[PDB]
Amino acid sequence: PNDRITLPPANAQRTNMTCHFCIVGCGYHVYKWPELQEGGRAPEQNALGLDFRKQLPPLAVTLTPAMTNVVTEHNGRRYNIMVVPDKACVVNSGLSSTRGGKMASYMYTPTGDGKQRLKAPRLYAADQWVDTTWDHAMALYAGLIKKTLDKDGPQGVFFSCFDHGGAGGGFENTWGTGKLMFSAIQTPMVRIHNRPAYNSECHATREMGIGELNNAYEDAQLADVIWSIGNNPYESQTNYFLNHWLPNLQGATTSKKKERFPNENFPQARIIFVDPRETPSVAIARHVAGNDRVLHLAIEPGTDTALFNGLFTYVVEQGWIDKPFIEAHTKGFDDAVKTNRLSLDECSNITGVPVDMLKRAAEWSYKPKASGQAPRTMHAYEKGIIWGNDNYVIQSALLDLVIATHNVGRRGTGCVRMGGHQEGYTRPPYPGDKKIYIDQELIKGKGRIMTWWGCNNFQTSNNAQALREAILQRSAIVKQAMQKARGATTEEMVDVIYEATQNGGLFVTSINLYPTKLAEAAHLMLPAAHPGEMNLTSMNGERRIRLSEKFMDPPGTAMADCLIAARIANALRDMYQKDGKAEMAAQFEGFDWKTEEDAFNDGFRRAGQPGAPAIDSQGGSTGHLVTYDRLRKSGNNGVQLPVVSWDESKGLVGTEMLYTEGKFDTDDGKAHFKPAPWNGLPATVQQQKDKYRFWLNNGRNNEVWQTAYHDQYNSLMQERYPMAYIEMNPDDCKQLDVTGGDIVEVYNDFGSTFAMVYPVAEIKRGQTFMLFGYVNGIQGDVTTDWTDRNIIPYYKGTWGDIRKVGSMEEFKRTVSFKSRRFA
Amino acid sequence: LRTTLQYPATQVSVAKNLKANEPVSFTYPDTSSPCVAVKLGSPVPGGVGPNNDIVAYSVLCTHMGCPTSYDKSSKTFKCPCHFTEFDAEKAGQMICGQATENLPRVLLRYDEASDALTAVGVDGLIYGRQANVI
Ligand SMILES: Nc1nc2c(c(=O)[nH]1)N[C@H]1C(S)=C(S)[C@@H](COP(=O)(O)OP(=O)(O)OC[C@H]3O[C@@H](n4cnc5c(=O)[nH]c(N)nc54)[C@H](O)[C@@H]3O)O[C@H]1N2
Ligand SMILES: Nc1nc2c(c(=O)[nH]1)N[C@H]1C(S)=C(S)[C@@H](COP(=O)(O)OP(=O)(O)OC[C@H]3O[C@@H](n4cnc5c(=O)[nH]c(N)nc54)[C@H](O)[C@@H]3O)O[C@H]1N2
Ligand code: F3S
Ligand code: FES
Ligand SMILES: [Mo]
C-alpha cells in the first residue's frame, strides 16, 4: 500500500550510513526493526521523535514510501528498514537528494528494485549463462591469471577498476583491489572507472602544489563570490549547493562572515557560472539571488583556457592581485604573465563572452573591497573542465588566476573539485613509469584477461562504440573456443581459454552488484556487496571521513570487494605454493582478511607507519589514529582529514582548510605558476566540428545516478526517463521536424547512438545536451579518442549530426517534456 | 480487519463551475491537507468531467512539505524550498527535483447526474503523515 508507512519503534536499532552516491556524503540513519512491530504516532513512541498525531509542518521530516523497505536476512527473518537523513549531520542538516532518498528502495530484497542483484558466481559456459561455485570461479580466474603471469608476465593481465569512495569504492576496497593489482599481480595494465589510463583528474593543480580538495563546505558559506566552472551543482552536488551555497546567496551567513572578520565589508554574495549551457543551477541561482547577482559566462565549448588567461592578464594589468603573497609563497608568476598574455578583445572573440561581462566577473571576484581586502572568491570546478579541452592546460590557466589572487588558503576561498563520487583512496604505488591507454590496447588485441571491477565502460568509455565492438568480438572468440569442451577439467578449460586468447580472444570478468550490459560480453561475473551489507569508510568533498555501518546481509554469497580481492590473492598464493614457486607465492601474502575492517587496518591505518610498504592514502601518515570505533563515536560528522590528534576526551580532531600558512605541496613549499597555451580545439575534435552540425554536450540529470544500475529497475525512474534524452534548441527541432518524445539517431565518424528529443528553450542553436552513461542510448559512442598529455579524455568535446527516426507515441503519452529550469 | 483507510467523501464543486486552467483550493482529507483541483482544458489520462481534463492534487511538496504553487502557464506545481516541479498533466510526475514520490493525486468522482465533483481518496502518501487519514 501507497497511503501509509510503518513507523520505527521507539527502541528500533539505528545505525549510521553515509549516502551511497555523490561526493557530498550526506549523513543518514538506518532504522531496522522486526517486520511485525511498529512505533506509535506520539513523538516519544517512535524512533523519529516526530508527532504523527497531527500534520507535520514543512521541513520537519523527509519521509516517503521509497525511504522504507522490508529486508529478509540469511536466517529468513524479515525486518522493516527506514533510511532517512540525519538532521544533526553538518554536511546536509537533514537534507536528502532524490538519489540518496532512494537508498532504502535500492537495498537488496528478493522482491524489490534489487531483485536482480548478483547472488552467486555466474559463468558463460560457451553458449549459456549458468551458476557456478566460488571455488570453481576462483580456480578458473586465478588459473588464467597464473598461466598469463607464467607465460606473458603481468602485461597480459588487464583491469578497469574503481578508484573512488562510497558504494563500490572506499578505503577498504581501493586498498584490497590496489594491493591485489599492484603488489601481488604487479600489473601496470590498469585503468580507472572513469578514465582509460592510471592517471589523475588533477595532475596540473597537484603539480602546482594545490591538492584539489583544499577547503571545507563552510568556505562556501563564507565566500563573497562562488565560481562554478564546468559544473551543474544543483543536479550533481545537490546538498552542498542547497545547504551551504544557497544560504550564502540568501544572506543567512552574513552574520557569520562579520563575526569572523570584524573589519571587512561583506557585500551580498554573488555567483559566476562558466558553462556553455544554461543549466538548472543557473536558473535556480537567478531565482534565489536575482539576475543582477548571477553571471552566466556562456563560453564557446572548449574555450576555458582562453577565459582564464584573459582574466589572469586583466587582474595583473589592474593590479587586482596579492603581490606580497606572490613574492613570499609562489614561483613562476612573471613567466606566467608573459606566456598567458591575452587581451580582453581576443578573450571575448575566442570565448564569445562580451568584454563588459569579462570585466564584471573580474570586478566582482578580484577588485579589492572598500575595506581593503580582496573578495573571498571560492573557485569550484568539475567535469566541464576536467573532461574539457586539455585537462592539464585548463587547470594550469585557472590555478594561475587563483594563486595570483590568493584564493587558496584564506577562509571563504579555495580552488576545489566539486567531486563526483565520494573519495576513499588507499593503494600501493602504480607499478610502472608509463601512461598506457588501456582501451586502445584492448581494441588492438592486447591482454589475455580483462576484469571490469565496479564499473561499466560499455556505457562510460570515451569512443565507447569502438570499445564495445572490439570487446564483444574478442569475447565471442573465447565463447566459440569453449564450445568444443566436454567434461573438461578446470585446468583443461584454462588452457582452452588461453589458446583462444592467443588467437585474438579475451576472457572477460565483471565484479559487480548487477549483470549490466557487460553480461553481453562477460564469461564470469562475481557478486559484490554495497554499504550496509558491509562496513565502509569514505570521505566527501571536504575530506570528511565517516563509517557507514553494516546493518543487513548481502544477497546470497555476495561479498565486499576487498574480500573478493583477498579471495583471488589466496587462490593464486595456494596455486603457486602447490606448483613449488615460493617467490611467486610470497607476492600474494598479506590477504589473511576475515572482514572489511582487516583491509582498513592493513591499508589506511598502515600508511606512513614504521615497517609499512609504500602507500598512497588520502588519510596520510596520521590515518592510524582513525579506527571504526572512533568513527562510530564521531557519528555522521566524522572528522576532516588529515587527523591532527586523537584522545578519549576530545575524539578525532581534523583539518578544516589546507594551505592556510601558504605552505604548498611542492619541493620548495611555494605554489608554482604554469604556462597555459591556447591551442584551440584538438584537431580530432575540430574535424568532427567541421563535418557535423551539433555540439554533443553531455553529463548528469539530477534524478539519474550514473549508469542507472539501480535506476534501470525503478518503475518511477523508467516512467520518467525510459530512454536517454537529448536537450535540443526548439528552432533546431522545427528544422528537423522533431518534438518531445521523438527518437533521433546522433552520429559522427566515431559512432551512432539514439536519444529521445527533449526541446529546451535554453539550449543554443547548434548545441545539444545528452544524458551520459545510460541503459537505453549510450552517449559515449559519439565521443572521440582524443585525450590530453596524461590521457584524460575530452568527453565534453565532440560534434555530430541528428537524424529523426520517428515518433514514440508512448513517450509522448507518459513522459513530461516540461522545463527542468525552475523559474 | 480492514486493509484500507477510511477516506471521507468531500464535495469540491460542480464541474461546470470550474474555469479552464483556474485552480480551486480545497482541503482533503482534513483541514490540514491543502489541495488544488484544476480543469486543464484538454483531456489527460485519469482526468474527469465532461472533457476528461479535471485533476486534483495535494499541494504539499513530497520532498519536505513546503506548499507548492500552481503555475497556469506550464500546468505544473512548483516548490519554493528546493525547486522540485511536478507535472499536473502527467499524474504529478516529478519533472526535476529532490522528491522520491510523485505529487499525490486526489481521486475525484465525477457524477454526470448532478455535475458534482467529490474527493473520495488519495493516490500516494501526503507529506508529513504516517497515513493519509490521521
Ligand atoms: N560521455 C561521457 N562519458 C563519461 C562521463 C561524461 O561526463 N561523459 N563521465 C565519466 C565519469 S565522471 C565517470 S564517474 C564514469 C562512470 O563510469 P563507470 O564507473 O563505468 O559507471 P558507474 O555507474 O559509476 O559504475 C558503477 C558500477 O559498479 C557497480 N557497483 C555498484 N556498487 C558496487 C559495489 O559495491 N561493488 C562493485 N564491485 N560494483 C558495484 C554498478 O552496478 C555499476 O555497474 O563515466 C565517465 N564517462
Ligand atoms: N544527479 C547526479 N549527480 C551526480 C552523478 C550522477 O550520475 N547523477 N555523478 C557524479 C559524478 S561521478 C560526477 S563526475 C559529477 C559531475 O558533476 P558535473 O561536472 O557538475 O556534471 P556534468 O553534467 O558532467 O558536467 C558539468 C557541466 O559541464 C558543462 N560543460 C560542457 N562542456 C564544457 C566546457 O567545454 N567548458 C565548461 N566550462 N563547461 C562545460 C556542461 O554543460 C555541464 O553543465 O556528478 C556527480 N553527481
Ligand atoms: S543525498 Fe546523496 S546523492 Fe549527494 S546530495 Fe546527498 S550525497
Ligand atoms: S520541500 Fe519541496 S523541493 Fe524540498
Ligand atoms: Mo565521475
PDB file of C-alpha atoms in Angstrom, chain A residues 322-530:
ATOM      1  CA  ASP A 322      48.234  39.931  -3.917  1.00  0.00           C
ATOM      2  CA  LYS A 323      51.835  40.968  -4.625  1.00  0.00           C
ATOM      3  CA  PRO A 324      53.176  40.143  -1.085  1.00  0.00           C
ATOM      4  CA  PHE A 325      51.547  36.664  -1.341  1.00  0.00           C
ATOM      5  CA  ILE A 326      53.112  36.162  -4.807  1.00  0.00           C
ATOM      6  CA  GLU A 327      56.586  37.280  -3.541  1.00  0.00           C
ATOM      7  CA  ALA A 328      56.574  35.120  -0.331  1.00  0.00           C
ATOM      8  CA  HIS A 329      54.682  31.949  -1.408  1.00  0.00           C
ATOM      9  CA  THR A 330      54.893  31.485  -5.233  1.00  0.00           C
ATOM     10  CA  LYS A 331      57.341  30.736  -8.116  1.00  0.00           C
ATOM     11  CA  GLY A 332      56.885  31.442 -11.877  1.00  0.00           C
ATOM     12  CA  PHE A 333      54.480  34.497 -11.780  1.00  0.00           C
ATOM     13  CA  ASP A 334      56.474  36.761 -14.221  1.00  0.00           C
ATOM     14  CA  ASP A 335      56.856  33.834 -16.688  1.00  0.00           C
ATOM     15  CA  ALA A 336      53.062  33.085 -16.491  1.00  0.00           C
ATOM     16  CA  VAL A 337      52.175  36.758 -17.170  1.00  0.00           C
ATOM     17  CA  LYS A 338      54.262  36.553 -20.415  1.00  0.00           C
ATOM     18  CA  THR A 339      53.192  33.093 -21.612  1.00  0.00           C
ATOM     19  CA  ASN A 340      49.474  33.590 -20.735  1.00  0.00           C
ATOM     20  CA  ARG A 341      49.063  37.152 -22.043  1.00  0.00           C
ATOM     21  CA  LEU A 342      45.677  37.548 -23.790  1.00  0.00           C
ATOM     22  CA  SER A 343      43.753  40.829 -24.263  1.00  0.00           C
ATOM     23  CA  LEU A 344      40.094  41.139 -23.300  1.00  0.00           C
ATOM     24  CA  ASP A 345      39.178  41.753 -27.013  1.00  0.00           C
ATOM     25  CA  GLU A 346      40.961  38.450 -28.007  1.00  0.00           C
ATOM     26  CA  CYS A 347      39.478  36.669 -24.938  1.00  0.00           C
ATOM     27  CA  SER A 348      35.934  37.840 -25.993  1.00  0.00           C
ATOM     28  CA  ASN A 349      36.420  36.857 -29.668  1.00  0.00           C
ATOM     29  CA  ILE A 350      37.593  33.313 -28.639  1.00  0.00           C
ATOM     30  CA  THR A 351      35.050  32.606 -25.803  1.00  0.00           C
ATOM     31  CA  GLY A 352      32.186  34.717 -27.278  1.00  0.00           C
ATOM     32  CA  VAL A 353      31.731  36.308 -23.845  1.00  0.00           C
ATOM     33  CA  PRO A 354      31.340  40.126 -24.178  1.00  0.00           C
ATOM     34  CA  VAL A 355      34.109  42.331 -22.737  1.00  0.00           C
ATOM     35  CA  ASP A 356      31.692  44.017 -20.255  1.00  0.00           C
ATOM     36  CA  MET A 357      30.859  40.544 -18.726  1.00  0.00           C
ATOM     37  CA  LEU A 358      34.622  39.546 -18.516  1.00  0.00           C
ATOM     38  CA  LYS A 359      35.319  42.905 -16.713  1.00  0.00           C
ATOM     39  CA  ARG A 360      32.292  42.470 -14.374  1.00  0.00           C
ATOM     40  CA  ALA A 361      33.422  38.862 -13.490  1.00  0.00           C
ATOM     41  CA  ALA A 362      36.853  40.271 -12.529  1.00  0.00           C
ATOM     42  CA  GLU A 363      35.384  43.349 -10.689  1.00  0.00           C
ATOM     43  CA  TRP A 364      33.098  41.110  -8.533  1.00  0.00           C
ATOM     44  CA  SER A 365      35.799  38.481  -7.835  1.00  0.00           C
ATOM     45  CA  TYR A 366      39.246  40.194  -7.604  1.00  0.00           C
ATOM     46  CA  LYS A 367      38.930  44.006  -7.290  1.00  0.00           C
ATOM     47  CA  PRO A 368      39.581  44.979  -3.630  1.00  0.00           C
ATOM     48  CA  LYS A 369      36.537  45.632  -1.432  1.00  0.00           C
ATOM     49  CA  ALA A 370      36.058  49.100   0.123  1.00  0.00           C
ATOM     50  CA  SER A 371      37.636  47.846   3.463  1.00  0.00           C
ATOM     51  CA  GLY A 372      40.825  46.930   1.501  1.00  0.00           C
ATOM     52  CA  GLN A 373      40.698  43.095   1.446  1.00  0.00           C
ATOM     53  CA  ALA A 374      40.416  41.025  -1.765  1.00  0.00           C
ATOM     54  CA  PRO A 375      36.975  39.371  -2.200  1.00  0.00           C
ATOM     55  CA  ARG A 376      36.874  35.816  -0.807  1.00  0.00           C
ATOM     56  CA  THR A 377      36.316  34.023  -4.122  1.00  0.00           C
ATOM     57  CA  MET A 378      35.798  30.256  -3.924  1.00  0.00           C
ATOM     58  CA  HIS A 379      36.592  28.650  -7.337  1.00  0.00           C
ATOM     59  CA  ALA A 380      34.734  25.304  -7.728  1.00  0.00           C
ATOM     60  CA  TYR A 381      35.191  23.207 -10.897  1.00  0.00           C
ATOM     61  CA  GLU A 382      34.148  19.768 -12.175  1.00  0.00           C
ATOM     62  CA  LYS A 383      33.788  17.711 -15.394  1.00  0.00           C
ATOM     63  CA  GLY A 384      33.082  20.654 -17.768  1.00  0.00           C
ATOM     64  CA  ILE A 385      36.859  21.384 -17.382  1.00  0.00           C
ATOM     65  CA  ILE A 386      38.164  18.026 -16.050  1.00  0.00           C
ATOM     66  CA  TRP A 387      36.757  16.385 -19.244  1.00  0.00           C
ATOM     67  CA  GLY A 388      37.228  19.681 -21.135  1.00  0.00           C
ATOM     68  CA  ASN A 389      39.628  20.826 -23.844  1.00  0.00           C
ATOM     69  CA  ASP A 390      43.054  19.792 -22.439  1.00  0.00           C
ATOM     70  CA  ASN A 391      42.529  18.979 -18.729  1.00  0.00           C
ATOM     71  CA  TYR A 392      46.142  19.910 -17.803  1.00  0.00           C
ATOM     72  CA  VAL A 393      46.171  23.295 -19.610  1.00  0.00           C
ATOM     73  CA  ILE A 394      42.783  24.452 -18.206  1.00  0.00           C
ATOM     74  CA  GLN A 395      43.807  23.760 -14.584  1.00  0.00           C
ATOM     75  CA  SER A 396      47.147  25.465 -15.392  1.00  0.00           C
ATOM     76  CA  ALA A 397      45.265  28.628 -16.509  1.00  0.00           C
ATOM     77  CA  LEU A 398      42.718  28.629 -13.687  1.00  0.00           C
ATOM     78  CA  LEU A 399      45.192  27.914 -10.834  1.00  0.00           C
ATOM     79  CA  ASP A 400      47.381  30.804 -12.126  1.00  0.00           C
ATOM     80  CA  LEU A 401      44.396  33.139 -11.704  1.00  0.00           C
ATOM     81  CA  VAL A 402      43.615  31.658  -8.209  1.00  0.00           C
ATOM     82  CA  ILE A 403      47.238  31.783  -6.967  1.00  0.00           C
ATOM     83  CA  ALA A 404      47.831  35.379  -8.168  1.00  0.00           C
ATOM     84  CA  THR A 405      44.605  36.472  -6.345  1.00  0.00           C
ATOM     85  CA  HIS A 406      45.371  34.469  -3.142  1.00  0.00           C
ATOM     86  CA  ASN A 407      42.115  32.409  -3.442  1.00  0.00           C
ATOM     87  CA  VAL A 408      43.642  29.352  -1.747  1.00  0.00           C
ATOM     88  CA  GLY A 409      44.300  29.104   1.988  1.00  0.00           C
ATOM     89  CA  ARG A 410      42.007  32.060   3.054  1.00  0.00           C
ATOM     90  CA  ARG A 411      38.631  31.178   4.598  1.00  0.00           C
ATOM     91  CA  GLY A 412      35.763  31.587   2.077  1.00  0.00           C
ATOM     92  CA  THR A 413      38.144  30.641  -0.750  1.00  0.00           C
ATOM     93  CA  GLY A 414      39.670  27.518  -2.324  1.00  0.00           C
ATOM     94  CA  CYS A 415      40.123  26.253  -5.868  1.00  0.00           C
ATOM     95  CA  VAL A 416      38.475  22.870  -5.486  1.00  0.00           C
ATOM     96  CA  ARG A 417      36.940  19.953  -7.319  1.00  0.00           C
ATOM     97  CA  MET A 418      33.232  19.750  -6.600  1.00  0.00           C
ATOM     98  CA  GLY A 419      33.828  15.958  -6.920  1.00  0.00           C
ATOM     99  CA  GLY A 420      31.901  13.055  -8.439  1.00  0.00           C
ATOM    100  CA  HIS A 421      31.731  10.045  -6.191  1.00  0.00           C
ATOM    101  CA  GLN A 422      32.928  10.255  -2.621  1.00  0.00           C
ATOM    102  CA  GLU A 423      36.692   9.669  -2.189  1.00  0.00           C
ATOM    103  CA  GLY A 424      38.332   6.729  -0.456  1.00  0.00           C
ATOM    104  CA  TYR A 425      41.760   6.050  -1.939  1.00  0.00           C
ATOM    105  CA  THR A 426      44.484   3.970  -0.219  1.00  0.00           C
ATOM    106  CA  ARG A 427      46.730   1.979  -2.631  1.00  0.00           C
ATOM    107  CA  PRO A 428      50.298   0.924  -3.275  1.00  0.00           C
ATOM    108  CA  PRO A 429      52.065   2.967  -5.984  1.00  0.00           C
ATOM    109  CA  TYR A 430      51.168   2.193  -9.630  1.00  0.00           C
ATOM    110  CA  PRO A 431      53.893  -0.321 -10.744  1.00  0.00           C
ATOM    111  CA  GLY A 432      55.177   1.260 -13.906  1.00  0.00           C
ATOM    112  CA  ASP A 433      56.609   4.572 -15.193  1.00  0.00           C
ATOM    113  CA  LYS A 434      54.356   4.737 -18.390  1.00  0.00           C
ATOM    114  CA  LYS A 435      50.843   6.089 -19.129  1.00  0.00           C
ATOM    115  CA  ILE A 436      49.002   3.387 -21.035  1.00  0.00           C
ATOM    116  CA  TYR A 437      45.682   3.909 -22.901  1.00  0.00           C
ATOM    117  CA  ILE A 438      44.052   0.620 -21.789  1.00  0.00           C
ATOM    118  CA  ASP A 439      41.007   0.895 -24.123  1.00  0.00           C
ATOM    119  CA  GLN A 440      43.320   1.309 -27.201  1.00  0.00           C
ATOM    120  CA  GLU A 441      45.446  -1.672 -26.013  1.00  0.00           C
ATOM    121  CA  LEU A 442      42.268  -3.843 -25.796  1.00  0.00           C
ATOM    122  CA  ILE A 443      40.997  -2.649 -29.197  1.00  0.00           C
ATOM    123  CA  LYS A 444      44.448  -3.520 -30.695  1.00  0.00           C
ATOM    124  CA  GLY A 445      44.087  -7.061 -29.288  1.00  0.00           C
ATOM    125  CA  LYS A 446      46.357  -6.901 -26.178  1.00  0.00           C
ATOM    126  CA  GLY A 447      45.705  -8.796 -22.932  1.00  0.00           C
ATOM    127  CA  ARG A 448      44.549 -12.363 -22.107  1.00  0.00           C
ATOM    128  CA  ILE A 449      42.131 -11.441 -19.292  1.00  0.00           C
ATOM    129  CA  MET A 450      40.192  -8.214 -18.575  1.00  0.00           C
ATOM    130  CA  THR A 451      38.289  -7.592 -15.318  1.00  0.00           C
ATOM    131  CA  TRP A 452      35.767  -4.702 -15.060  1.00  0.00           C
ATOM    132  CA  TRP A 453      35.605  -4.150 -11.281  1.00  0.00           C
ATOM    133  CA  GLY A 454      32.775  -1.902 -10.084  1.00  0.00           C
ATOM    134  CA  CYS A 455      32.482  -0.056 -13.432  1.00  0.00           C
ATOM    135  CA  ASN A 456      30.814  -0.477 -16.826  1.00  0.00           C
ATOM    136  CA  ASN A 457      32.852   1.112 -19.617  1.00  0.00           C
ATOM    137  CA  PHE A 458      30.410  -0.373 -22.185  1.00  0.00           C
ATOM    138  CA  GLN A 459      28.275   2.641 -21.020  1.00  0.00           C
ATOM    139  CA  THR A 460      31.037   5.081 -19.904  1.00  0.00           C
ATOM    140  CA  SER A 461      34.207   4.775 -22.021  1.00  0.00           C
ATOM    141  CA  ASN A 462      35.145   7.565 -24.416  1.00  0.00           C
ATOM    142  CA  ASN A 463      34.825   6.324 -28.027  1.00  0.00           C
ATOM    143  CA  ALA A 464      32.579   3.675 -26.414  1.00  0.00           C
ATOM    144  CA  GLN A 465      31.335   2.124 -29.670  1.00  0.00           C
ATOM    145  CA  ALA A 466      34.893   1.151 -30.804  1.00  0.00           C
ATOM    146  CA  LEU A 467      35.461  -0.376 -27.315  1.00  0.00           C
ATOM    147  CA  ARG A 468      32.201  -2.363 -27.179  1.00  0.00           C
ATOM    148  CA  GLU A 469      32.671  -3.652 -30.757  1.00  0.00           C
ATOM    149  CA  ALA A 470      36.226  -4.916 -30.038  1.00  0.00           C
ATOM    150  CA  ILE A 471      35.356  -6.481 -26.633  1.00  0.00           C
ATOM    151  CA  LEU A 472      32.220  -8.321 -27.984  1.00  0.00           C
ATOM    152  CA  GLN A 473      34.354  -9.670 -30.901  1.00  0.00           C
ATOM    153  CA  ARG A 474      37.244 -10.765 -28.622  1.00  0.00           C
ATOM    154  CA  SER A 475      34.721 -12.255 -26.113  1.00  0.00           C
ATOM    155  CA  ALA A 476      32.987 -14.264 -28.931  1.00  0.00           C
ATOM    156  CA  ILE A 477      36.339 -15.922 -29.920  1.00  0.00           C
ATOM    157  CA  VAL A 478      36.614 -17.264 -26.295  1.00  0.00           C
ATOM    158  CA  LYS A 479      32.945 -18.327 -26.271  1.00  0.00           C
ATOM    159  CA  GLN A 480      33.458 -20.190 -29.642  1.00  0.00           C
ATOM    160  CA  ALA A 481      36.600 -21.964 -28.269  1.00  0.00           C
ATOM    161  CA  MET A 482      34.733 -23.069 -25.025  1.00  0.00           C
ATOM    162  CA  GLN A 483      32.032 -24.858 -27.264  1.00  0.00           C
ATOM    163  CA  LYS A 484      34.115 -27.954 -28.199  1.00  0.00           C
ATOM    164  CA  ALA A 485      34.768 -28.774 -24.473  1.00  0.00           C
ATOM    165  CA  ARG A 486      33.130 -31.954 -22.974  1.00  0.00           C
ATOM    166  CA  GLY A 487      33.716 -32.956 -19.314  1.00  0.00           C
ATOM    167  CA  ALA A 488      36.869 -30.705 -19.360  1.00  0.00           C
ATOM    168  CA  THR A 489      38.663 -30.221 -16.011  1.00  0.00           C
ATOM    169  CA  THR A 490      39.203 -26.614 -14.795  1.00  0.00           C
ATOM    170  CA  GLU A 491      42.894 -26.975 -15.843  1.00  0.00           C
ATOM    171  CA  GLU A 492      41.883 -28.046 -19.395  1.00  0.00           C
ATOM    172  CA  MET A 493      39.346 -25.209 -19.680  1.00  0.00           C
ATOM    173  CA  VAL A 494      42.060 -22.663 -18.554  1.00  0.00           C
ATOM    174  CA  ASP A 495      44.223 -23.965 -21.488  1.00  0.00           C
ATOM    175  CA  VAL A 496      41.283 -23.831 -23.975  1.00  0.00           C
ATOM    176  CA  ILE A 497      40.591 -20.182 -22.983  1.00  0.00           C
ATOM    177  CA  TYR A 498      44.316 -19.185 -23.070  1.00  0.00           C
ATOM    178  CA  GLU A 499      44.678 -20.714 -26.562  1.00  0.00           C
ATOM    179  CA  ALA A 500      41.620 -18.682 -27.706  1.00  0.00           C
ATOM    180  CA  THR A 501      43.328 -15.523 -26.277  1.00  0.00           C
ATOM    181  CA  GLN A 502      46.398 -16.381 -28.444  1.00  0.00           C
ATOM    182  CA  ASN A 503      44.010 -16.158 -31.414  1.00  0.00           C
ATOM    183  CA  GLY A 504      42.735 -12.626 -30.553  1.00  0.00           C
ATOM    184  CA  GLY A 505      40.275 -13.707 -27.822  1.00  0.00           C
ATOM    185  CA  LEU A 506      39.846 -12.035 -24.425  1.00  0.00           C
ATOM    186  CA  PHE A 507      38.438 -13.624 -21.238  1.00  0.00           C
ATOM    187  CA  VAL A 508      36.148 -11.056 -19.565  1.00  0.00           C
ATOM    188  CA  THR A 509      35.261 -10.880 -15.831  1.00  0.00           C
ATOM    189  CA  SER A 510      32.847  -8.402 -14.233  1.00  0.00           C
ATOM    190  CA  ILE A 511      32.768  -7.841 -10.462  1.00  0.00           C
ATOM    191  CA  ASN A 512      29.577  -6.000  -9.785  1.00  0.00           C
ATOM    192  CA  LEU A 513      26.191  -5.677  -7.998  1.00  0.00           C
ATOM    193  CA  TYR A 514      24.238  -6.471 -11.260  1.00  0.00           C
ATOM    194  CA  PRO A 515      24.722  -8.217 -14.672  1.00  0.00           C
ATOM    195  CA  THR A 516      24.772  -4.823 -16.533  1.00  0.00           C
ATOM    196  CA  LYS A 517      25.362  -4.546 -20.335  1.00  0.00           C
ATOM    197  CA  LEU A 518      28.762  -6.114 -19.530  1.00  0.00           C
ATOM    198  CA  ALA A 519      26.980  -9.520 -19.387  1.00  0.00           C
ATOM    199  CA  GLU A 520      26.720  -9.255 -23.255  1.00  0.00           C
ATOM    200  CA  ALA A 521      30.492  -9.996 -23.319  1.00  0.00           C
ATOM    201  CA  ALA A 522      31.472 -11.374 -19.853  1.00  0.00           C
ATOM    202  CA  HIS A 523      32.472 -15.040 -19.297  1.00  0.00           C
ATOM    203  CA  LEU A 524      32.429 -14.737 -15.458  1.00  0.00           C
ATOM    204  CA  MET A 525      30.552 -12.402 -13.080  1.00  0.00           C
ATOM    205  CA  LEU A 526      31.255 -12.235  -9.323  1.00  0.00           C
ATOM    206  CA  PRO A 527      28.798 -10.729  -6.816  1.00  0.00           C
ATOM    207  CA  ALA A 528      29.773  -7.708  -4.643  1.00  0.00           C
ATOM    208  CA  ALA A 529      28.275  -6.112  -1.513  1.00  0.00           C
ATOM    209  CA  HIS A 530      27.423  -2.373  -1.101  1.00  0.00           C
TER     210      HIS A 530
END
